[PDB]
Amino acid sequence: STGSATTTPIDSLDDAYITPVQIGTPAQTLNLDFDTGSSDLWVFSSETTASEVDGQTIYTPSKSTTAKLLSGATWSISYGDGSSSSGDVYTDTVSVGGLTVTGQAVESAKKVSSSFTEDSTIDGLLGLAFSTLNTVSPTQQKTFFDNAKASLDSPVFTADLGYHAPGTYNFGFIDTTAYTGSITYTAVSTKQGFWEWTSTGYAVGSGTFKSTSIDGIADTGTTLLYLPATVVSAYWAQVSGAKSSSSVGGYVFPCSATLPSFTFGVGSARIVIPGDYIDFGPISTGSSSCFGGIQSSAGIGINIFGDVALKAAFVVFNGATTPTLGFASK
Ligand SMILES: NCC(=O)N[C@@H]1CCOc2ccccc21
Ligand SMILES: NCC(=O)N[C@@H]1CCOc2ccccc21
């Protein structure tokens, strides 16, 4: 089997991407944030505290003839941005882009933190990291990808995120029309439960490539690119007026600037992030100070290849017995 679904930016900045997902019988379609940095499929629901729902579409398990309560199971998760959610668990039929999994754990939110309530465009998350990170207790549950894997034509999914435009998540096949050149594959460590890999270095604009190992995670659930302070300082030093602002929480730059590109290494290959992808717009409405798309990972404890980096590539999440990641230009 295969599946193919369009993913769409939630706003004009590409702060996140939503993908329609069918849950239950008859189908209830929710728009979920596909997150290769976590491993829970959770949804706003008829059980979510009413004051914490503001415009989201909800899953109602009592209206699904295939829903079953997963007796005694609870879940609770916290994300890198400080947001959180928790609740109980159903199993149900879940379909993405024509690919169907029966008996998928669908985690129903009883509580969500304010940032989730405040984002009416995201109805929940669909985790695509390794199932060892799944938070369901006392019986840990599998991700949608792990459950689908044996049925897929090939044990892979691909992320092709758009810049200010829709893109595609495919399951079970590699669309050779969606990228240019060849795909370069690189080793993955699953020891922390993430799609963790080592970039071979970087360049700023037209500058020379610096060969240096950068361990980080491929994380579609993070908006920006978080790299070591040395690397980030070298980037922003090429932008007149750019500075790290403690009050704003990161590097800002004059909105009148033209940003240089940023290149990262994948083995001997190179992925170029155009300068425009690094502009996240005014820090507040009408400000002439703009927020940067490359930020320091110091005090995260890991580097994060988030959407800013991933949307410059066609990315293969290869879930073979020994997982690997593939990157191509597009
Ligand atoms: N976008 C990815 C993300 O925020 N993941 C969070 C942050 C810290 O690590 C974990 C571990 C397990 C589950 C979720 C997370
Ligand atoms: N991943 C697909 C791809 O890169 N195709 C290229 C684009 C340019 O045209 C040609 C002509 C012959 C062979 C390959 C290609």
JSON list of N, CA and C in Angstrom, two decimals, residues 204-271:
[
{"chain": "A", "resi": 204, "resn": "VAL", "atom": "N", "xyz": [27.90, 29.94, 4.79]},
{"chain": "A", "resi": 204, "resn": "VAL", "atom": "CA", "xyz": [27.06, 31.13, 4.87]},
{"chain": "A", "resi": 204, "resn": "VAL", "atom": "C", "xyz": [27.15, 31.87, 3.55]},
{"chain": "A", "resi": 205, "resn": "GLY", "atom": "N", "xyz": [26.02, 32.05, 2.88]},
{"chain": "A", "resi": 205, "resn": "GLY", "atom": "CA", "xyz": [26.01, 32.71, 1.59]},
{"chain": "A", "resi": 205, "resn": "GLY", "atom": "C", "xyz": [26.96, 32.03, 0.62]},
{"chain": "A", "resi": 206, "resn": "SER", "atom": "N", "xyz": [27.79, 32.84, -0.04]},
{"chain": "A", "resi": 206, "resn": "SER", "atom": "CA", "xyz": [28.76, 32.36, -1.01]},
{"chain": "A", "resi": 206, "resn": "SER", "atom": "C", "xyz": [30.09, 32.00, -0.38]},
{"chain": "A", "resi": 207, "resn": "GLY", "atom": "N", "xyz": [30.16, 31.94, 0.95]},
{"chain": "A", "resi": 207, "resn": "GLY", "atom": "CA", "xyz": [31.40, 31.64, 1.63]},
{"chain": "A", "resi": 207, "resn": "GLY", "atom": "C", "xyz": [31.83, 30.19, 1.48]},
{"chain": "A", "resi": 208, "resn": "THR", "atom": "N", "xyz": [33.05, 29.92, 1.93]},
{"chain": "A", "resi": 208, "resn": "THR", "atom": "CA", "xyz": [33.58, 28.57, 1.85]},
{"chain": "A", "resi": 208, "resn": "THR", "atom": "C", "xyz": [32.90, 27.66, 2.87]},
{"chain": "A", "resi": 209, "resn": "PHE", "atom": "N", "xyz": [32.78, 26.39, 2.49]},
{"chain": "A", "resi": 209, "resn": "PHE", "atom": "CA", "xyz": [32.17, 25.39, 3.34]},
{"chain": "A", "resi": 209, "resn": "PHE", "atom": "C", "xyz": [33.11, 25.03, 4.49]},
{"chain": "A", "resi": 210, "resn": "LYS", "atom": "N", "xyz": [32.57, 24.99, 5.70]},
{"chain": "A", "resi": 210, "resn": "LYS", "atom": "CA", "xyz": [33.27, 24.61, 6.91]},
{"chain": "A", "resi": 210, "resn": "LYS", "atom": "C", "xyz": [32.89, 23.17, 7.23]},
{"chain": "A", "resi": 211, "resn": "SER", "atom": "N", "xyz": [33.88, 22.28, 7.20]},
{"chain": "A", "resi": 211, "resn": "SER", "atom": "CA", "xyz": [33.65, 20.88, 7.52]},
{"chain": "A", "resi": 211, "resn": "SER", "atom": "C", "xyz": [33.67, 20.74, 9.03]},
{"chain": "A", "resi": 212, "resn": "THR", "atom": "N", "xyz": [32.54, 20.34, 9.60]},
{"chain": "A", "resi": 212, "resn": "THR", "atom": "CA", "xyz": [32.42, 20.14, 11.03]},
{"chain": "A", "resi": 212, "resn": "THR", "atom": "C", "xyz": [31.17, 19.31, 11.28]},
{"chain": "A", "resi": 213, "resn": "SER", "atom": "N", "xyz": [31.25, 18.38, 12.22]},
{"chain": "A", "resi": 213, "resn": "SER", "atom": "CA", "xyz": [30.13, 17.49, 12.53]},
{"chain": "A", "resi": 213, "resn": "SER", "atom": "C", "xyz": [29.10, 18.20, 13.39]},
{"chain": "A", "resi": 214, "resn": "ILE", "atom": "N", "xyz": [27.85, 18.22, 12.93]},
{"chain": "A", "resi": 214, "resn": "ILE", "atom": "CA", "xyz": [26.74, 18.81, 13.67]},
{"chain": "A", "resi": 214, "resn": "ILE", "atom": "C", "xyz": [25.66, 17.74, 13.88]},
{"chain": "A", "resi": 215, "resn": "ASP", "atom": "N", "xyz": [25.58, 17.20, 15.10]},
{"chain": "A", "resi": 215, "resn": "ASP", "atom": "CA", "xyz": [24.56, 16.22, 15.41]},
{"chain": "A", "resi": 215, "resn": "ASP", "atom": "C", "xyz": [23.24, 16.93, 15.70]},
{"chain": "A", "resi": 216, "resn": "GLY", "atom": "N", "xyz": [22.16, 16.47, 15.07]},
{"chain": "A", "resi": 216, "resn": "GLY", "atom": "CA", "xyz": [20.87, 17.10, 15.30]},
{"chain": "A", "resi": 216, "resn": "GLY", "atom": "C", "xyz": [19.74, 16.19, 14.88]},
{"chain": "A", "resi": 217, "resn": "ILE", "atom": "N", "xyz": [18.51, 16.68, 15.02]},
{"chain": "A", "resi": 217, "resn": "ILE", "atom": "CA", "xyz": [17.33, 15.88, 14.71]},
{"chain": "A", "resi": 217, "resn": "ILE", "atom": "C", "xyz": [16.56, 16.51, 13.56]},
{"chain": "A", "resi": 218, "resn": "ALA", "atom": "N", "xyz": [15.99, 15.66, 12.72]},
{"chain": "A", "resi": 218, "resn": "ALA", "atom": "CA", "xyz": [15.08, 16.11, 11.66]},
{"chain": "A", "resi": 218, "resn": "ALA", "atom": "C", "xyz": [13.69, 16.17, 12.25]},
{"chain": "A", "resi": 219, "resn": "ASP", "atom": "N", "xyz": [13.16, 17.39, 12.42]},
{"chain": "A", "resi": 219, "resn": "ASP", "atom": "CA", "xyz": [11.99, 17.63, 13.26]},
{"chain": "A", "resi": 219, "resn": "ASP", "atom": "C", "xyz": [11.00, 18.53, 12.53]},
{"chain": "A", "resi": 220, "resn": "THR", "atom": "N", "xyz": [10.02, 17.92, 11.87]},
{"chain": "A", "resi": 220, "resn": "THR", "atom": "CA", "xyz": [9.01, 18.71, 11.17]},
{"chain": "A", "resi": 220, "resn": "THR", "atom": "C", "xyz": [8.12, 19.50, 12.12]},
{"chain": "A", "resi": 221, "resn": "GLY", "atom": "N", "xyz": [8.10, 19.16, 13.40]},
{"chain": "A", "resi": 221, "resn": "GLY", "atom": "CA", "xyz": [7.31, 19.85, 14.38]},
{"chain": "A", "resi": 221, "resn": "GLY", "atom": "C", "xyz": [7.94, 21.09, 14.96]},
{"chain": "A", "resi": 222, "resn": "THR", "atom": "N", "xyz": [9.16, 21.43, 14.57]},
{"chain": "A", "resi": 222, "resn": "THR", "atom": "CA", "xyz": [9.83, 22.65, 14.99]},
{"chain": "A", "resi": 222, "resn": "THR", "atom": "C", "xyz": [9.91, 23.60, 13.80]},
{"chain": "A", "resi": 223, "resn": "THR", "atom": "N", "xyz": [9.56, 24.88, 14.01]},
{"chain": "A", "resi": 223, "resn": "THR", "atom": "CA", "xyz": [9.50, 25.84, 12.91]},
{"chain": "A", "resi": 223, "resn": "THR", "atom": "C", "xyz": [10.89, 26.17, 12.37]},
{"chain": "A", "resi": 224, "resn": "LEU", "atom": "N", "xyz": [11.84, 26.44, 13.25]},
{"chain": "A", "resi": 224, "resn": "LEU", "atom": "CA", "xyz": [13.10, 27.07, 12.90]},
{"chain": "A", "resi": 224, "resn": "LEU", "atom": "C", "xyz": [14.26, 26.07, 12.89]},
{"chain": "A", "resi": 225, "resn": "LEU", "atom": "N", "xyz": [15.43, 26.57, 12.52]},
{"chain": "A", "resi": 225, "resn": "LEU", "atom": "CA", "xyz": [16.68, 25.82, 12.48]},
{"chain": "A", "resi": 225, "resn": "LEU", "atom": "C", "xyz": [17.52, 26.24, 13.68]},
{"chain": "A", "resi": 226, "resn": "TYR", "atom": "N", "xyz": [17.79, 25.31, 14.59]},
{"chain": "A", "resi": 226, "resn": "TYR", "atom": "CA", "xyz": [18.54, 25.60, 15.82]},
{"chain": "A", "resi": 226, "resn": "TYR", "atom": "C", "xyz": [19.90, 24.91, 15.75]},
{"chain": "A", "resi": 227, "resn": "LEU", "atom": "N", "xyz": [20.97, 25.70, 15.78]},
{"chain": "A", "resi": 227, "resn": "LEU", "atom": "CA", "xyz": [22.32, 25.21, 15.57]},
{"chain": "A", "resi": 227, "resn": "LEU", "atom": "C", "xyz": [23.26, 25.77, 16.62]},
{"chain": "A", "resi": 228, "resn": "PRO", "atom": "N", "xyz": [24.49, 25.26, 16.72]},
{"chain": "A", "resi": 228, "resn": "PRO", "atom": "CA", "xyz": [25.39, 25.74, 17.77]},
{"chain": "A", "resi": 228, "resn": "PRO", "atom": "C", "xyz": [25.64, 27.23, 17.66]},
{"chain": "A", "resi": 229, "resn": "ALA", "atom": "N", "xyz": [25.90, 27.86, 18.81]},
{"chain": "A", "resi": 229, "resn": "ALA", "atom": "CA", "xyz": [26.06, 29.31, 18.87]},
{"chain": "A", "resi": 229, "resn": "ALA", "atom": "C", "xyz": [27.15, 29.82, 17.95]},
{"chain": "A", "resi": 230, "resn": "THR", "atom": "N", "xyz": [28.23, 29.05, 17.77]},
{"chain": "A", "resi": 230, "resn": "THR", "atom": "CA", "xyz": [29.30, 29.47, 16.86]},
{"chain": "A", "resi": 230, "resn": "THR", "atom": "C", "xyz": [28.79, 29.62, 15.44]},
{"chain": "A", "resi": 231, "resn": "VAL", "atom": "N", "xyz": [28.03, 28.63, 14.99]},
{"chain": "A", "resi": 231, "resn": "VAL", "atom": "CA", "xyz": [27.51, 28.61, 13.62]},
{"chain": "A", "resi": 231, "resn": "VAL", "atom": "C", "xyz": [26.54, 29.76, 13.43]},
{"chain": "A", "resi": 232, "resn": "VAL", "atom": "N", "xyz": [25.64, 29.94, 14.39]},
{"chain": "A", "resi": 232, "resn": "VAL", "atom": "CA", "xyz": [24.60, 30.96, 14.28]},
{"chain": "A", "resi": 232, "resn": "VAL", "atom": "C", "xyz": [25.21, 32.35, 14.30]},
{"chain": "A", "resi": 233, "resn": "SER", "atom": "N", "xyz": [26.23, 32.57, 15.14]},
{"chain": "A", "resi": 233, "resn": "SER", "atom": "CA", "xyz": [26.94, 33.85, 15.16]},
{"chain": "A", "resi": 233, "resn": "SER", "atom": "C", "xyz": [27.60, 34.13, 13.81]},
{"chain": "A", "resi": 234, "resn": "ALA", "atom": "N", "xyz": [28.23, 33.12, 13.21]},
{"chain": "A", "resi": 234, "resn": "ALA", "atom": "CA", "xyz": [28.84, 33.31, 11.90]},
{"chain": "A", "resi": 234, "resn": "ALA", "atom": "C", "xyz": [27.81, 33.69, 10.84]},
{"chain": "A", "resi": 235, "resn": "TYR", "atom": "N", "xyz": [26.61, 33.11, 10.90]},
{"chain": "A", "resi": 235, "resn": "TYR", "atom": "CA", "xyz": [25.56, 33.49, 9.96]},
{"chain": "A", "resi": 235, "resn": "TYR", "atom": "C", "xyz": [25.16, 34.96, 10.13]},
{"chain": "A", "resi": 236, "resn": "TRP", "atom": "N", "xyz": [24.74, 35.34, 11.34]},
{"chain": "A", "resi": 236, "resn": "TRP", "atom": "CA", "xyz": [24.15, 36.66, 11.55]},
{"chain": "A", "resi": 236, "resn": "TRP", "atom": "C", "xyz": [25.18, 37.78, 11.45]},
{"chain": "A", "resi": 237, "resn": "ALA", "atom": "N", "xyz": [26.47, 37.47, 11.61]},
{"chain": "A", "resi": 237, "resn": "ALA", "atom": "CA", "xyz": [27.51, 38.47, 11.39]},
{"chain": "A", "resi": 237, "resn": "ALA", "atom": "C", "xyz": [27.53, 38.95, 9.94]},
{"chain": "A", "resi": 238, "resn": "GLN", "atom": "N", "xyz": [26.93, 38.21, 9.00]},
{"chain": "A", "resi": 238, "resn": "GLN", "atom": "CA", "xyz": [26.86, 38.64, 7.61]},
{"chain": "A", "resi": 238, "resn": "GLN", "atom": "C", "xyz": [25.66, 39.53, 7.31]},
{"chain": "A", "resi": 239, "resn": "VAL", "atom": "N", "xyz": [24.86, 39.88, 8.32]},
{"chain": "A", "resi": 239, "resn": "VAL", "atom": "CA", "xyz": [23.65, 40.68, 8.14]},
{"chain": "A", "resi": 239, "resn": "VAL", "atom": "C", "xyz": [23.85, 41.97, 8.93]},
{"chain": "A", "resi": 240, "resn": "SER", "atom": "N", "xyz": [23.94, 43.11, 8.24]},
{"chain": "A", "resi": 240, "resn": "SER", "atom": "CA", "xyz": [24.16, 44.39, 8.92]},
{"chain": "A", "resi": 240, "resn": "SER", "atom": "C", "xyz": [23.01, 44.69, 9.87]},
{"chain": "A", "resi": 241, "resn": "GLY", "atom": "N", "xyz": [23.33, 44.98, 11.12]},
{"chain": "A", "resi": 241, "resn": "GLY", "atom": "CA", "xyz": [22.34, 45.34, 12.10]},
{"chain": "A", "resi": 241, "resn": "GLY", "atom": "C", "xyz": [21.75, 44.17, 12.86]},
{"chain": "A", "resi": 242, "resn": "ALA", "atom": "N", "xyz": [22.09, 42.94, 12.50]},
{"chain": "A", "resi": 242, "resn": "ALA", "atom": "CA", "xyz": [21.54, 41.80, 13.22]},
{"chain": "A", "resi": 242, "resn": "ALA", "atom": "C", "xyz": [22.18, 41.67, 14.59]},
{"chain": "A", "resi": 243, "resn": "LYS", "atom": "N", "xyz": [21.39, 41.21, 15.56]},
{"chain": "A", "resi": 243, "resn": "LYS", "atom": "CA", "xyz": [21.86, 41.13, 16.93]},
{"chain": "A", "resi": 243, "resn": "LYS", "atom": "C", "xyz": [21.02, 40.10, 17.65]},
{"chain": "A", "resi": 244, "resn": "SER", "atom": "N", "xyz": [21.58, 39.53, 18.70]},
{"chain": "A", "resi": 244, "resn": "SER", "atom": "CA", "xyz": [20.81, 38.66, 19.58]},
{"chain": "A", "resi": 244, "resn": "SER", "atom": "C", "xyz": [20.15, 39.52, 20.64]},
{"chain": "A", "resi": 245, "resn": "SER", "atom": "N", "xyz": [18.83, 39.40, 20.75]},
{"chain": "A", "resi": 245, "resn": "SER", "atom": "CA", "xyz": [18.03, 40.17, 21.69]},
{"chain": "A", "resi": 245, "resn": "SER", "atom": "C", "xyz": [17.51, 39.26, 22.80]},
{"chain": "A", "resi": 246, "resn": "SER", "atom": "N", "xyz": [17.96, 39.50, 24.03]},
{"chain": "A", "resi": 246, "resn": "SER", "atom": "CA", "xyz": [17.45, 38.74, 25.16]},
{"chain": "A", "resi": 246, "resn": "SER", "atom": "C", "xyz": [15.97, 39.04, 25.41]},
{"chain": "A", "resi": 247, "resn": "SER", "atom": "N", "xyz": [15.53, 40.28, 25.15]},
{"chain": "A", "resi": 247, "resn": "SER", "atom": "CA", "xyz": [14.14, 40.62, 25.40]},
{"chain": "A", "resi": 247, "resn": "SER", "atom": "C", "xyz": [13.21, 39.92, 24.41]},
{"chain": "A", "resi": 248, "resn": "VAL", "atom": "N", "xyz": [13.65, 39.76, 23.16]},
{"chain": "A", "resi": 248, "resn": "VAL", "atom": "CA", "xyz": [12.82, 39.11, 22.16]},
{"chain": "A", "resi": 248, "resn": "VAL", "atom": "C", "xyz": [12.97, 37.59, 22.23]},
{"chain": "A", "resi": 249, "resn": "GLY", "atom": "N", "xyz": [14.14, 37.10, 22.62]},
{"chain": "A", "resi": 249, "resn": "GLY", "atom": "CA", "xyz": [14.39, 35.69, 22.73]},
{"chain": "A", "resi": 249, "resn": "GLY", "atom": "C", "xyz": [15.15, 35.08, 21.57]},
{"chain": "A", "resi": 250, "resn": "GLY", "atom": "N", "xyz": [15.98, 35.85, 20.89]},
{"chain": "A", "resi": 250, "resn": "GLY", "atom": "CA", "xyz": [16.76, 35.32, 19.79]},
{"chain": "A", "resi": 250, "resn": "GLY", "atom": "C", "xyz": [17.30, 36.42, 18.90]},
{"chain": "A", "resi": 251, "resn": "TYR", "atom": "N", "xyz": [17.93, 35.98, 17.81]},
{"chain": "A", "resi": 251, "resn": "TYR", "atom": "CA", "xyz": [18.46, 36.90, 16.81]},
{"chain": "A", "resi": 251, "resn": "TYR", "atom": "C", "xyz": [17.34, 37.59, 16.05]},
{"chain": "A", "resi": 252, "resn": "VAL", "atom": "N", "xyz": [17.47, 38.91, 15.95]},
{"chain": "A", "resi": 252, "resn": "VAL", "atom": "CA", "xyz": [16.61, 39.77, 15.16]},
{"chain": "A", "resi": 252, "resn": "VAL", "atom": "C", "xyz": [17.48, 40.53, 14.17]},
{"chain": "A", "resi": 253, "resn": "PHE", "atom": "N", "xyz": [16.85, 41.06, 13.14]},
{"chain": "A", "resi": 253, "resn": "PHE", "atom": "CA", "xyz": [17.59, 41.75, 12.09]},
{"chain": "A", "resi": 253, "resn": "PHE", "atom": "C", "xyz": [16.70, 42.82, 11.48]},
{"chain": "A", "resi": 254, "resn": "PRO", "atom": "N", "xyz": [17.27, 43.83, 10.83]},
{"chain": "A", "resi": 254, "resn": "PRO", "atom": "CA", "xyz": [16.43, 44.88, 10.25]},
{"chain": "A", "resi": 254, "resn": "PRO", "atom": "C", "xyz": [15.58, 44.29, 9.14]},
{"chain": "A", "resi": 255, "resn": "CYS", "atom": "N", "xyz": [14.28, 44.61, 9.14]},
{"chain": "A", "resi": 255, "resn": "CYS", "atom": "CA", "xyz": [13.41, 44.04, 8.12]},
{"chain": "A", "resi": 255, "resn": "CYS", "atom": "C", "xyz": [13.80, 44.49, 6.72]},
{"chain": "A", "resi": 256, "resn": "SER", "atom": "N", "xyz": [14.56, 45.58, 6.60]},
{"chain": "A", "resi": 256, "resn": "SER", "atom": "CA", "xyz": [15.05, 46.07, 5.31]},
{"chain": "A", "resi": 256, "resn": "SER", "atom": "C", "xyz": [16.21, 45.25, 4.74]},
{"chain": "A", "resi": 257, "resn": "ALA", "atom": "N", "xyz": [16.73, 44.27, 5.48]},
{"chain": "A", "resi": 257, "resn": "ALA", "atom": "CA", "xyz": [17.89, 43.51, 5.04]},
{"chain": "A", "resi": 257, "resn": "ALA", "atom": "C", "xyz": [17.52, 42.48, 3.99]},
{"chain": "A", "resi": 258, "resn": "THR", "atom": "N", "xyz": [18.51, 42.13, 3.17]},
{"chain": "A", "resi": 258, "resn": "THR", "atom": "CA", "xyz": [18.45, 40.97, 2.30]},
{"chain": "A", "resi": 258, "resn": "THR", "atom": "C", "xyz": [19.32, 39.90, 2.95]},
{"chain": "A", "resi": 259, "resn": "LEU", "atom": "N", "xyz": [18.74, 38.73, 3.23]},
{"chain": "A", "resi": 259, "resn": "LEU", "atom": "CA", "xyz": [19.46, 37.72, 3.98]},
{"chain": "A", "resi": 259, "resn": "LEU", "atom": "C", "xyz": [20.29, 36.83, 3.06]},
{"chain": "A", "resi": 260, "resn": "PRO", "atom": "N", "xyz": [21.46, 36.40, 3.51]},
{"chain": "A", "resi": 260, "resn": "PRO", "atom": "CA", "xyz": [22.23, 35.41, 2.75]},
{"chain": "A", "resi": 260, "resn": "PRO", "atom": "C", "xyz": [21.65, 34.01, 2.94]},
{"chain": "A", "resi": 261, "resn": "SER", "atom": "N", "xyz": [21.96, 33.14, 1.99]},
{"chain": "A", "resi": 261, "resn": "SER", "atom": "CA", "xyz": [21.57, 31.74, 2.09]},
{"chain": "A", "resi": 261, "resn": "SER", "atom": "C", "xyz": [22.38, 31.04, 3.18]},
{"chain": "A", "resi": 262, "resn": "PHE", "atom": "N", "xyz": [21.95, 29.83, 3.54]},
{"chain": "A", "resi": 262, "resn": "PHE", "atom": "CA", "xyz": [22.67, 28.99, 4.48]},
{"chain": "A", "resi": 262, "resn": "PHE", "atom": "C", "xyz": [22.70, 27.57, 3.92]},
{"chain": "A", "resi": 263, "resn": "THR", "atom": "N", "xyz": [23.89, 26.99, 3.82]},
{"chain": "A", "resi": 263, "resn": "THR", "atom": "CA", "xyz": [24.07, 25.65, 3.27]},
{"chain": "A", "resi": 263, "resn": "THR", "atom": "C", "xyz": [24.42, 24.70, 4.40]},
{"chain": "A", "resi": 264, "resn": "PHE", "atom": "N", "xyz": [23.81, 23.51, 4.41]},
{"chain": "A", "resi": 264, "resn": "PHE", "atom": "CA", "xyz": [24.23, 22.46, 5.32]},
{"chain": "A", "resi": 264, "resn": "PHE", "atom": "C", "xyz": [24.63, 21.21, 4.55]},
{"chain": "A", "resi": 265, "resn": "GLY", "atom": "N", "xyz": [25.59, 20.48, 5.11]},
{"chain": "A", "resi": 265, "resn": "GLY", "atom": "CA", "xyz": [26.12, 19.29, 4.47]},
{"chain": "A", "resi": 265, "resn": "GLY", "atom": "C", "xyz": [25.37, 18.02, 4.86]},
{"chain": "A", "resi": 266, "resn": "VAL", "atom": "N", "xyz": [25.18, 17.14, 3.87]},
{"chain": "A", "resi": 266, "resn": "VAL", "atom": "CA", "xyz": [24.64, 15.80, 4.07]},
{"chain": "A", "resi": 266, "resn": "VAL", "atom": "C", "xyz": [25.64, 14.90, 3.37]},
{"chain": "A", "resi": 267, "resn": "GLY", "atom": "N", "xyz": [26.50, 14.23, 4.14]},
{"chain": "A", "resi": 267, "resn": "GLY", "atom": "CA", "xyz": [27.64, 13.58, 3.52]},
{"chain": "A", "resi": 267, "resn": "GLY", "atom": "C", "xyz": [28.40, 14.55, 2.63]},
{"chain": "A", "resi": 268, "resn": "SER", "atom": "N", "xyz": [28.72, 14.14, 1.41]},
{"chain": "A", "resi": 268, "resn": "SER", "atom": "CA", "xyz": [29.40, 15.03, 0.48]},
{"chain": "A", "resi": 268, "resn": "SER", "atom": "C", "xyz": [28.45, 15.96, -0.26]},
{"chain": "A", "resi": 269, "resn": "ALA", "atom": "N", "xyz": [27.15, 15.85, -0.03]},
{"chain": "A", "resi": 269, "resn": "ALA", "atom": "CA", "xyz": [26.16, 16.67, -0.71]},
{"chain": "A", "resi": 269, "resn": "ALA", "atom": "C", "xyz": [25.85, 17.93, 0.10]},
{"chain": "A", "resi": 270, "resn": "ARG", "atom": "N", "xyz": [25.12, 18.85, -0.51]},
{"chain": "A", "resi": 270, "resn": "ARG", "atom": "CA", "xyz": [24.87, 20.15, 0.08]},
{"chain": "A", "resi": 270, "resn": "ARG", "atom": "C", "xyz": [23.42, 20.53, -0.18]},
{"chain": "A", "resi": 271, "resn": "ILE", "atom": "N", "xyz": [22.74, 21.00, 0.87]},
{"chain": "A", "resi": 271, "resn": "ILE", "atom": "CA", "xyz": [21.39, 21.56, 0.77]},
{"chain": "A", "resi": 271, "resn": "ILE", "atom": "C", "xyz": [21.47, 23.05, 1.05]}
]
